[PDB]
Amino acid sequence: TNLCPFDEVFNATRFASVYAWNRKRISNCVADYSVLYNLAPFFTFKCYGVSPTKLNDLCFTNVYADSFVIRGDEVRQIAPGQTGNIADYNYKLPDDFTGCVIAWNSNKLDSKVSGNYNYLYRLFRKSNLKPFERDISTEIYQAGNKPCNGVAGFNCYFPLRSYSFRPTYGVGHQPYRVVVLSFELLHAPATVCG
């Protein structure tokens, strides 16, 4: 009957790149999800599969919290059955998704005056990802037919590129933190409730 360590997820000072999205597993706690339901900052609260008011009286075996930071206009890709750089190469949700997506604009900390280099988004990949698949590999994307051997060049591209999040940047390009809640049910006792 301890409180789920949610704050450490949403209030973290550092979030992971969308290509290297972080995953916090939750267990054996009581989650007052209402705590984050009472906050206007978390405006974007697109949830699929369940109503938030209803699930506060529900129980699941495990809950997973995936977090990363994306661009302002690229939040939509965080939804089941979408396409783009993010959903194809970085963070794909399955067609049959039964959790929520929370996203808000962190322009005060996720942005720099000199431009930030702490954020990368995978741009090239030979194949689209599988639901919840993670790829941190940084091997050159061979688009031509001559091997790249590990140096960028013609038809040889280093995959990750860095977002130039800046304070004066346009909303569509202003920074954005995303928290993705998955809820699973299995034969194991439900250790997460409200």
Epitope: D7, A12, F15, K24, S67
Partner: antibody, heavy 127, light 111 residues
Framework: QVQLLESGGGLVQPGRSLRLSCAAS????????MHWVRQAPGKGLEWVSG????????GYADSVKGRFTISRDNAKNSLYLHMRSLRAEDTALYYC????????????????????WGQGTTVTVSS | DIVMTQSPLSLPVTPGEPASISCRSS???????????LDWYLQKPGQSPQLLIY???NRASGVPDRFSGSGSGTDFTLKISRVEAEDVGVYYC?????????FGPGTKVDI
């Protein structure tokens, strides 16, 4: 007992890549912010990069910014450091150190206190 | 982009006396909490370095009570109440506030 083992050293020509790996064994790897610190040959130390508890990088050194790329993996307890645009001035030992204060144990999250240090590798570059 | 200095650059110590070393910064490290973020580290020659003091003056774990840390603002000092035969090497002071972090040029202590 706590163990931090690094691997990836070896002579490589200028203008290539390398991938150093540091593996931790003996503690909850997700409550400690790791750091990668170089050590020039016969000189003082120099901070290179780091990573917080949530896989969120904390910036690189001013003179190295542009090439190095850090990454973490809590599932395999492994921290990795991809290195690009290798130049002659990048020959040094490399230690991977761990923070002291466990997160949420007391204002903001902790990042200081490189206490436990593995025996670094011996990366070198020449032609 | 913070630059730190140390003094004296190199001092010879003899076993059985205290010694004092000063680390100076450019911007005062007083955070909103009221804590200084400077750390003191000893890199023994031929062995990986080790931690001495964290959080300004809070003594690190596992080291004897012969070390003392003090100071604030832009000036901090480390004093060895009693020095012995196993206190020779290099000393560094490292910032823990405005990233990137930095390490001082280093003080060389010998017999």
């Amino acid at each position: 007992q706590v163990q931090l083992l690094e691997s990836g050293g070896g002579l490589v020509q200028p203008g290539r890549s390398l991938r150093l790996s540091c593996a931790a064994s003996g503690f909850t790897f997700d409550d400690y912010a790791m750091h990668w610190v170089r050590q020039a040959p016969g000189k003082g130390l120099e901070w290179v990069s780091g990573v917080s508890w949530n896989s969120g990088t904390i910036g690189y050194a001013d003179s190295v910014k542009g090439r190095f790329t850090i990454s973490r993996d809590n599932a395999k307890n492994s921290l990795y450091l991809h290195m690009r645009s290798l130049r002659a001035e990048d020959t040094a030992l490399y230690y991977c150190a761990k923070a002291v204060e466990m997160v949420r144990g007391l204002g903001a999250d902790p990042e200081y206190g490189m206490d436990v240090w593995g025996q670094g590798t011996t990366v070198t570059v020449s032609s | 982009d913070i630059v730190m200095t140390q003094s004296p650059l190199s001092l010879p110590v003899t076993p059985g006396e205290p010694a004092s070393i000063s680390c100076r910064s450019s911007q005062s490290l007083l955070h909103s909490n009221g804590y200084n973020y400077l750390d003191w580290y000893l890199q023994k020659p031929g062995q990986s370095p080790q931690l001495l003091i964290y959080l300004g003056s809070n003594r690190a774990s596992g080291v004897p009570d012969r070390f003392s840390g003090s100071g604030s603002g832009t000036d901090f000092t480390l004093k060895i109440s009693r020095v012995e035969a196993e206190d020779v090497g290099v000393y560094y002071c490292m910032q823990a506030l405005q990233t990137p972090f930095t390490f001082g040029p280093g003080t060389k202590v010998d017999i």
